[PDB]
Amino acid sequence: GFPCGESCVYLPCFTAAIGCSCKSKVCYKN
């Protein structure tokens, strides 16, 4: 539910390293 401070408009979420995933162009976790 919280943004991870990373766009995934183009690139993937490298914040996947701390559990974030791309949700409609915004990297998010819980």
From Swiss-Prot:
There is a cross-link at G1-N30 (Cyclopeptide (Gly-Asn)). Keywords: Disulfide bond, Knottin, Plant defense. PROSITE patterns: CYCLOTIDE, CYCLOTIDE_BRACELET. Disulfide bonds join C4-C20, C8-C22, C13-C27. Pfam families: Cyclotide. This is a cyclic peptide. GO terms for biological process: cytolysis in another organism; defense response; hemolysis in another organism. Probably participates in a plant defense mechanism. Has strong cytotoxic activity against HUVEC cells (LC(50)= 0.58 uM) and various cancer cells including HeLa (LC(50)= 0.48 uM), MCF-7 and K562. Also displays some hemolytic activity. Binds to and induces leakage in phospholipd membranes, particularly ones containing 1-palmitoyl-2-oleophosphatidylethanolamine (POPE). The presence of a 'disulfide through disulfide knot' structurally defines this protein as a knottin. Belongs to the cyclotide family. Bracelet subfamily. This is Cyclotide hyen-D. It comes from Pigea enneasperma (Spade flower). The lineage of its organism: Eukaryota, Viridiplantae, Streptophyta, Embryophyta, Tracheophyta.
